């Protein structure tokens, strides 16, 4: 029922500003107050900002002071966070958070019964690469992928089939290379007697480079 | 601002066994303490909240504990897919703080890799270099020795290995280990091995490939 | 499936005016909701008013709390279909589970 | 009138194995019915187990009450019927006025 | 055994007065005091349990207050249907004991009586004794005035009235006064009259009938 | 849901008995003590008796031990009350007392949620003796009705049109005459265009004597 959809990430130099949303439904927006949880990669969980229902205060921590700026509509029925003089240790997938239904809202010290799905901000003065796709073909039960190489900033989609082709996938996590740049595979079992009737595809997505590959992968 | 410490920072358990995460903080925060559960590449779900009341669609093997300074989360049945970080928090004091999170893996059988050898795409030998890719399949525990050789050359700084997270319903790994080539050091050579030893295996077993054929 | 016509008890129904909501040492507030298209036509919302309970002082103790009390109710809505919905109906003051381990 | 088939939510339920109608200050008790011409099979009744509440010793402080809290639901026997629910028990100060 | 002791014993209001009626006790009963209220003919229904909550389907009008020797029912806004005797009960101590009862009436305005007289049955007449009766329908105050007058000769000793309980739509009382006389007297005599005085007629009315026709 | 039904009043002579029943239905009679509670004509509310749910306690009112005996049969779901001795205090209506649903029947101090509807005991030497039903004709809205003469003890009951027609009835209270026995009048107020097209009948009942009486009106 209650559903939180942020947007609005991605890749920023330091320095540079970022506006994250979250568009919140399935609740009375306007009566909770909202906060913005933050994760960098591969840590834990950090509170960053918390907003009051009517609008009227904002509490931050310490790091984010003068920096970040909570702020809602409550009319759109939506969350914000102005995010400016962003420094490297601002990279982190940020979270929207929302109040439980069951509690008064002017409760301040409720806790986080709702979150959104998280936006990735990456704050690099790096630029964007797109990945390039080589197919892994199935050597002559069988084994084939993709090779999703040398890409920057995350995040790498892949999916098979588009969608259809899901049992027996396994989509490896990304792992730097010494060039500075991500590479990962994606791989997938299939009966070896599919092979010349099923053709297999596997969608690379790389929404920040707006890069769309579907590879088709072959034998030789 | 309230520290919290949760103990331990890992664990592994098999399915069916009683789990204990506790979680200690500072300065008390009085009935203050939640419990959240985060999967991989997932958002965090609560579990407990003020120490031991749990949302509506939480399992009943989990349970809170708790009172002032000392605080504990419990899974009196650990099961395949709870594979997941827990984190507590406090609502207590103004900087609302999580722990560091503890990561629970589940405790299987031995289960043995099945591999496969991947030579690089013509398509990428254009770009002058090669990567040649062996898969480790659905194994258990994490631990692989994954030896590269070309031509009976056994490889030292040229590759990297990538896991994945355990699986959520039959708790397995998979792991990918990729070679890095110049097209050049590629096409000098001919036999191209990837040799793994494993725990489930009754003896390292070797895929190999030869340029073309 | 044929949904007959009547409803037994349809006169029946519960007073949220008590303020038993407010006596209460785990107060709570209430919130409603109207649509037609389902029946009943109104839905009563509970929220526990505090985290802690209140004694007959006014003071609120935080070494206990008000935690809600949840019932899942039929509504059919409109052709017509059935459907489960979970309704808060008030709060009750618990202690938490606190082992022999301090 | 026609009943379209097909239950929304129909994988949901509410959690009695949290001890909480006994770490309540109005604690209570509970009791089910099955009855096969009814959805659902099974309705669930709460009786309040005391007169007063009790405290963090474990004594009765009959100065207030343990109250039942109800809710009417809707039960179907196909017709519908309304039924009174006891969820569970609050405590509460008497007025004094 | 616990004494209670209620006040007053009797009580008329105008429709949507506030209405209070106490009890009080002996000793202290605590909060295991109750009320019930009890309509003419009919068993007694719950209103009140433990000094101050309502069963089911009372209405919102009635309200419980007290400690422990001092309670108070209240009728916020009096309706017509609220005419009964109002108890109080405690629990408390092993002799259950209830007060005396209360006694709650309806103020209105005034209603005229609409009057009608009866001839005695020729049925009844074989049995060797007659009765006349008069009918006195839907009037307020209770208070009325029934003259007998057999060949314009008044009457004294020999009728019986009867009046009913406040009617719970429109809290009116009626009456019926019947006149007992032999075959005899009865067949004597020939204009049977009934001449009725109350609050709300200008002066008083007669019906009358003659014996036969 | 929950129903209390009495049963076994009536006429008994002083030094007589009389056994009162309740059959319950609608809650679990196991689970929930019960309780006499009695009312004398035109008096108050009086406890009189109570028994626990196993039946291993019996609590009474002074007047009535050593006579009265209060009994349960959890299996007829069904409360009894033995009357012995009976003596002219004991006139009354006696009600069937039951506790709440909504609170454990464990407690002893519970207050009486569900009433039955009770039954006159009327201990007197008098004889029964059955009414006479003579009509009260319409004298040509208009007001019409039946006069219950001469019975004895305690009470008659009149319905019109066998319930059909209850608007505009006044059923009056019983009034004792010089003889000893009762009688009343039971009156309704109808148009004076249905006079001659609808009929119009009082039924009159006095279980005591067994009298059953359907008597039509008419001018
Ligand atoms: C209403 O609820 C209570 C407790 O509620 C939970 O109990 C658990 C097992 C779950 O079923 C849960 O869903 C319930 O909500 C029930 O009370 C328990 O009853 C048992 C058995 O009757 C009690 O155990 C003993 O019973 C014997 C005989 O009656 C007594 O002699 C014992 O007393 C000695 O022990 C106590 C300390 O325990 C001493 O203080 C005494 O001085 C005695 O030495 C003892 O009572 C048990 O204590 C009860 N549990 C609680 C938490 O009170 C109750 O049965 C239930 N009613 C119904 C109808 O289900
Ligand atoms: C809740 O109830 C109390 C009094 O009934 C009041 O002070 C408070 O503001 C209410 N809050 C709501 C309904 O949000």
């Known amino acids: ?220 | 601002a309230i520290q919290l410490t949760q103990s331990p920072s890992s664990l592994s358990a098999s399915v069916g066994d009683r789990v204990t995460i506790t979680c200690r903080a500072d300065e008390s925060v009085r009935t203050l303490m939640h419990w959240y559960q985060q999967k991989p590449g997932k958002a965090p779900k609560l579990l407990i909240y003020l120490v031991s009341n749990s949302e509506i669609g939480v399992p009943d093997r989990f349970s809170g504990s708790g009172s002032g300074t000392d605080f504990r989360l419990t899974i009196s049945s650990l099961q395949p897919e709870d594979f997941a970080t827990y984190y507590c928090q406090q609502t207590w004091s103004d900087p609302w703080t999580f722990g560091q999170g503890t990561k629970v893996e589940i405790k299987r059988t031995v289960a043995a890799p099945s591999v496969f050898i991947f030579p690089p795409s013509d398509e990428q030998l254009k770009s002058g270099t090669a990567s040649v890719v062996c898969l480790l399949n659905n194994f258990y525990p994490r631990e692989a020795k994954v030896q590269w050789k070309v031509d009976n050359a056994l490889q030292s700084g040229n590759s990297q290995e990538s896991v994945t997270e355990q699986d959520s319903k039959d708790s397995t790994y998979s792991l990918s280990s990729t070679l890095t080539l110049s097209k050049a050091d590629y096409e000098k050579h001919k036999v191209y091995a990837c040799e793994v030893t494993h725990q489930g295996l009754s003896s390292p077993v070797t895929k190999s490939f030869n340029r073309g054929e | 499936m044929k949904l007959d016509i009547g409803i037994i008890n349809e006169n029946q129904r519960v007073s949220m005016s008590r303020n038993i909501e407010s006596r209460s040492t785990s107060p709570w507030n209430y919130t409603v909701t109207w649509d037609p298209n389902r029946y009943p036509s109104e839905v009563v919302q509970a929220q526990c008013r505090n985290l802690g309970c209140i004694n007959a002082q006014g003071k609120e103790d935080i070494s206990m709390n008000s935690v809600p009390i949840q019932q899942e109710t039929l509504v059919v809505r409109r052709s017509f279909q059935l459907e489960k919905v979970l309704v808060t109906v008030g709060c009750t003051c618990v202690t938490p589970v606190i082992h022999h381990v301090q």
């Open chain 1, 1 to 220: 029922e209650v559903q939180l959809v942020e947007s609005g990430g991605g890749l920023v130099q330091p320095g540079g500003s970022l506006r994250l949303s979250c568009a919140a439904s399935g609740f009375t927006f306007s009566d909770y107050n909202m906060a913005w949880v933050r994760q960098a990669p591969g840590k834990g969980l950090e509170w960053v900002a918390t907003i009051t229902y009517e609008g009227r205060n904002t509490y931050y921590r310490d790091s984010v002071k003068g920096r970040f700026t909570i702020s809602r509509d409550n009319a759109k029925n939506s969350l914000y966070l102005q995010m400016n003089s962003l420094r490297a240790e601002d990279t982190a997938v940020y979270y929207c958070a929302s109040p439980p239904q069951y509690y008064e809202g002017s409760i301040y010290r409720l806790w986080f019964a709702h979150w959104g799905q998280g936006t990735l901000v990456t704050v690099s003065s790096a630029s964007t690469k797109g990945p390039s796709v080589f197919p892994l073909a199935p050597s002559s039960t069988a084994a084939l992928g993709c090779l999703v190489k040398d890409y920057f900033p995350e995040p790498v989609t892949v999916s098979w089939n588009s969608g259809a082709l899901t049992s027996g996938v396994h989509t490896f996590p990304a792992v730097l290379q010494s060039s500075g740049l991500y590479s990962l595979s994606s791989v997938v079992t299939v009966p070896s007697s599919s092979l010349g009737t099923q053709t297999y595809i596997c969608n690379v997505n790389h929404k920040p480079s707006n890069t769309k590959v579907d590879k088709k992968v072959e034998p030789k």
